[PDB]
Every structure is written in C-alpha cells, then in structure tokens.
C-alpha cells in the first residue's frame, strides 16, 4: 500500500492531465451510457410508465430498473413502489449509497418512505433550493423554531443545526406513527449543478464528517442533488475511493475512470461534467496525499 500510493502520486506528478485530456476522458463515459440506450442494456421501463413519468424531475434522467430503489412501506392507498433512486454498490457490498433526485412536491412522502424503509441515518444534500432562477429541490427537512413538518404519517423536526464553514449538519427527528429516529442531514450550499467548488477541501471535510457518524455499510447513506447524478456521482466516487484508501485496499490497477464507469452502470449519468470528473480526480489525488501521511 505505501508503495502503491507513492507510485500513483509520482505518476500524477510526472504527467499532468490537461483539460483536453479530461474532456477526451469524459466523452468516453458519455459514449458508454449512449451505447447503453442503443443496446437496451439497462432498461428504464418502470420509470417510463405513465403512472411514474411525472415523478421524475428530469425527463432524460431515468433510473435503471435492475438497480432502482423499490418502495413497499405503505402509508395510504395511493402509495406506490416507484421513486427516482438507485442503489450504488460500496467497496464491500450492494446498497452502500442511495442516489436520488431532489424531491418534487408529489414525492416528498415517497422520499421519507424510502428513508424510513431502508433505515437511512445519513442524508447528503449536494444542492440548493434555488439555482439559476429555478427550483431544484423541495423542502423535506425541518429547521429550528419550525416544529414538526408533516409528510403523510412522517413528522420531521430539527433539534440542532451545526453550521460549519461550507455546509450545515442538521439533526433531524422523524416520528413515524409511534417510533422516533435521528437522521443527520448534511447540506452543502454554493455548489451548483454543472459548476464546481473550490477547494476540494470542504467536500473532504464533509465526507470526513459523514463517516464519523457512520463508518460502515450497515445501512445505505442517502446522497442527492437536483438530478441525483452529477454532484451525487462526485461524492460517491470520492467516498468509495477514500474507503479503499483507509482500509488499505487500493488496487495496483487503480483508476478513477474505471470506478466512475462502474458507478455509471448503476445510476445513469453519474458525474455529469468533465469539470466534476476533474474534481473527483484532484480530490482522489489529495486523499492519496493524506493517506501517505497516515502511513508516515
């Protein structure tokens, strides 16, 4: 491992990646997903049902069937099984990450159903309510002072808001019929759909923080942006890479390309821009750096 990393590091130092390179790199990824439509490799038939088609915030952003997060917790006669969400495999097993879109008004209740069903503790919001004029996500959380917001049978209040330098940790209390849970919502603002931060540093603090609350894959961690692809992708790719590092199992053939390619067969369009692709690269190269430290 110590030698795997310093090799990785010395090559990166030895050959800088250019913008034209990263654009060539990212085009390959766009090509593969386009070859998945052509070939019908991963049908999106459930999402395409007329009963489901308006539950999708973006019409070309349709979850694959085989990896879709299915709902079965019933709270009314109108409760159905569809949400725009995919499981993404972690280092050790399936269902490490739930990648979903920002809820619409008609899917706020779906959202909470999903959270509750899968015993999610952690919610990562890589998104703002408004972005370039447009509504990007509806309010499913509660703030301090507001008491309990009501989503169907779910009652959502907020104990504490920790305002950190670049995101907020909201401690949510979610009552469902008789039982109460705590969910940590990590809310990262000033990062639009796609643009990118700087530095890479807040994003690594955020993932560092998240992993303090849940170090394992016992339950899915929920990651969402507006679409559930872009900013979402960035976070899953970075978190997954950091797990490989921290447990000292980064392979010799390690590739940011390959990881992202693999994630993209599970939730469509994960990491949506070459700039976001670069961000995951630079973030990963910073993590390797910090892992050499942990060795020394």
């Amino acid at each position: 491992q110590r030698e795997i990393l310093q090799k990785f590091l010395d090559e990166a130092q030895s050959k800088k990646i250019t913008k034209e390179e990263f654009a060539n790199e990212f085009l390959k990824l766009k090509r593969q997903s386009t070859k998945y439509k052509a070939d019908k490799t991963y049908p999106t038939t459930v999402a395409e049902k007329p009963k489901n088609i308006k539950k999708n915030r973006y019409k070309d952003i349709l979850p694959y069937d085989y990896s879709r997060v299915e709902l079965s917790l019933i709270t009314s006669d109108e409760d159905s099984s569809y949400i725009n969400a995919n499981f993404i495999k972690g280092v050790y097993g399936p269902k490490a990450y739930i990648a979903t879109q920002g809820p619409l008004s008609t899917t706020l209740l779906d959202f909470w159903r999903m959270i509750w069903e899968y015993s999610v503790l952690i919610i990562v919001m890589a998104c703002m309510e408004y972005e370039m004029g447009k509504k990007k996500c509806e309010r499913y959380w509660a703030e301090p002072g507001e008491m309990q917001l009501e989503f169907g049978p779910f009652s959502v209040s907020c104990e504490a808001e920790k305002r950190k330098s670049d995101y907020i940790i909201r401690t949510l209390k979610v009552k469902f019929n008789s039982e109460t849970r705590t969910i940590y919502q990590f809310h990262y603002k000033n990062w639009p759909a796609h643009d990118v931060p700087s530095s890479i540093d807040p994003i690594l603090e955020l993932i560092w923080d998240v992993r303090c609350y849940q170090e394992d894959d016992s339950v899915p961690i929920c990651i969402h942006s507006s679409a559930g692809c872009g900013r979402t992708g960035v976070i899953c790719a970075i978190d997954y890479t950091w797990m490989l590092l921290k447990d000292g199992i980064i392979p010799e053939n390690f590739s940011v390309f390959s990881l992202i390619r693999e994630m993209r067969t599970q939730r469509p369009s994960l990491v949506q821009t070459q700039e976001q692709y670069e961000l995951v690269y630079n973030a990963v190269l910073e993590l390797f750096k910090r892992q050499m430290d942990v060795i020394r």
Binding site: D60, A227, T273
Partner: peptide
C-alpha cells in the same frame, strides 16, 4: 420535457 443530461 424537462432535461438534465447534462451540463
């Protein structure tokens, strides 16, 4: 009708 893509 409503897209994403994207970028």
């Amino acid at each position: 009708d409503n897209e994403y893509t994207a970028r």
